[PDB]
């Protein structure tokens, strides 16, 4: 079988072709000892990476290696595939055709650093890499659509046809799901707390993806927020206390369609989908507008979906079928969409062999 | 039955002898690459042929095998005939006799390639070749008639005598169906928003064929364009952006009375009608000037036939009536009385067959 | 008092007295209208912004551009208007003539009311309003000719005979300079870059002023380009890192002849021209062709002349002289003639005062 490796900003997803879902599912985050030890407690091994890091996070640094979808710090990046390996799927490179993935917008150098890495030191006999929204309309059951791979470190808007993206409407937005939970932190501490270290803010983390919510108008729900306490949730704080999370719990959502609350000098991802759809050709357009793959765990909090639907049809034609599609499985959709990908019986002939590698270098990808 | 074909430079028309509507009618379109490659899901196709290749745009040149009413590139008209009949049609050529029609004043250099190749290329066992304003007038149901066939690279104004054409006065403006689009999208873009592009084309024709109309009086009508909305008729293109557009409307169908609207120096179809009864005997010039009939693609507009009438009746002496018969069908008319004429019993013994052709070759036809 | 000129497009107003030969105030012709309750990272929070602080302002305050080729927005016109006489120009409407050029189609309904402002919201003593080509052609010192003027919004084709263009046949197109940098922009994009914000799009733009040329033959070019490194010319960006571009720098601004790059049919600023000079009648075509004559911020792109010359010989008739006529000035034409034109005392009774309105 095949290798399928996501490599997400936050969270990497690797496995093999064919599995419905990820076998190694692990934060991208490799912890290097401030200065290594002999033993548990001090540190031992010169690196850590992911969950295992993530609970030493003490004598370790930690540090994320992929930054809006671009690896910045290729170490680290090989570090990661190092442990995926061995460590997580507990398979041996070599062994393998490896599937891995990158962001839209990004460059030569950067695909070729990684070309050349898995087939000169992973030396795997087949390898490729992949577009993470094409991938993702793959998972949909499209040719063709519009894609917001709205991650964790980058909101990618992708308008697909036919197979190809025409990356001439690919608008970034540069917030996406860690922005959301950092306004969160900020206005969590307005009502009254304080989060500001990692034990804190991972509480204000999972706040954000359990309790909130993106209001239909934020209007109606300004006003009441501010009266009943339909909008209050309660919240077992790991230490014993319950508390009430309120209102931050829609407006931290909203710093995705009002930058401005942020202080971002961005349109909202509503209105990116928009100017993508435009900045596209007449014809595409209208698919453009019913085939919205919805896509990412950003797009994960509850009405986000049928908001997108609303506000899209405003900005659309007053006789535009505009349809968002949401997959429940959004949230690995890249990983299902490379799977299948991996496992086409097909698609077989288009795995990069270690020979034309080795004739043709990196460049052809 | 046996086959029939109009090869317009843009609209190929096909079926049998016998049926009264056309079974087959795509563009004449042909789709070369702009670069080797290939269009995810589909291969690399030998070449695009009508609605395909224009339905997706991109990937091509998007050439014509004929304009102004003469064929100029051969491989091109092949590869059509190639999808007339397996793909248009589902025949093999070999089991079924051949029509097609030519241009009134079409070339023997060009009638010869095309019943070369009928018997070459693709040995249909009987071929006719037939001629466009002809067959329209045994269509319109008359003997005799200046016909005046606008298809799509020009008018053809032909003196049609007893079921014969005059060549003398066959006359033939390079002007039409094709002009006359270019032209709407350029005049909307100096009126008001950007009419450019690559799909509004055939947006910018849906609307020439639709809120066009030449205009019977000129003079008054650019002046009422500025006293009233009257004219101003809205579209709204895909994207819902409800346009209105108002004395183009007409200064774009009006190039075939006035060619200055698009730059071809001649005097207009009127004149052209009288300069080319006027190249017949006196005596023919009466039943001409009762049987005239508007034929093709570009007689299409409100207005069309009235207008020829009026100004007629200004190039006429107070006698003579001029009398156009705008036909129901005229877009398709010489497909139609190719097909019936084909099914006339007696044209069995009229056609061209395998065997003639291997005897004396082109020179047949 | 002397008289003043403001030239208006899409994007660079120019403004300036009568007599000078070199205009005084070009900016970006932007204003700012407040968003919502947003604060500058600098400056306070207040109002509607003109110009390059609007730039700077972006997040803040929504940004138009008053003026699509024709004046869209009304209240957002007279507002840079204000900021024109009085901020950019120093001086104040009541002792000044002034003179607002317009592109060539512009409806009688906005010519009505443009006379009405600033005559009343403003109250210079006399005023004109004039049609931008016949001001480049004259500029250029012509009696006839054709002027394909192009900028950042608007493209147009002006076939001048003895004072006039002939109205009927003057051939504007739509696609034009931000059409030029907003392709550059998404090339680059796909290539895994993206800018979106402030600095980084105005960086592209200047790279469009550096790098782009509009070739000859583009199939000659597409396949040097492809081939070998001489033109991979190179630019530094802010962050570090040299973009090299050698195809990417033609294929551009090719947009103007082949539209379909981005997506557009609608005829070629060549076809445009030949079709101009037809759309016409026929004796007067030869000084035509013979005086092509660019101007606007998108004529600036070196080769284009060179390249119009193949580009109306193709269709044209033989014996046609083709010239192409291009001024160094050529961004400014339009302001240069109508100070000249402004300033003509033969003129002077062409001043329509405060009295007639």
Known sequence: ??????????????????????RAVFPSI???????????????????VGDEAQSKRGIL???????????????????????????????APEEHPVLLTEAPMNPKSNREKMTQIMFETFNVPAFYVSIQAVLSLYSSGRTTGIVLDSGDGNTHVVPIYAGFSLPHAILRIDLAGRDLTDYLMKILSERGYSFSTTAEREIVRDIKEKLCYVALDFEQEMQTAAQSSSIEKSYELPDGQVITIGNERFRAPEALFHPSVL????????????????????????????????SGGTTMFPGIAERMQKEITAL???????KIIAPPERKYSVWIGGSILA???????????????DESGPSIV
Not at 35 to 47: E, R
Not at 316 to 322: D, E, Y
Not at 343 to 357: H, P
């Open 263 to 294: 202080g971002l000098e961005s349109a909202g991802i509503d209105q990116t989908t928009y100017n993508s759809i435009m900045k596209c050709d007449v014809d595409v357009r209208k698919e453009l507008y019913g085939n919205i793959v919805m």
């Open 61 to 91: 640094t930690l540090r994320y290696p992929i930054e809006h979808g671009i690896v910045t710090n290729w170490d680290d990046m090989e570090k990661i595939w190092h442990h995926t390996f061995y460590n997580e799927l507990r398979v």
């Open 343 to 357: 496992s086409l019986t097909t698609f077989q002939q288009m795995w990069i062999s270690k020979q034309e590698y």
């Open 1 to 22: 079988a095949a290798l399928v490796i996501d490599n997400g900003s936050g969270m990497c997803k690797a496995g093999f072709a064919g599995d419905d879902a990820p």
């Open 30 to 48: 490799v912890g290097r000892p401030r200065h290594q030890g002999i033993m548990v407690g001090m540190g031992q091994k010169d690196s850590y």
């Open 316 to 322: 659309a034609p007053s006789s535009m079928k505009v």
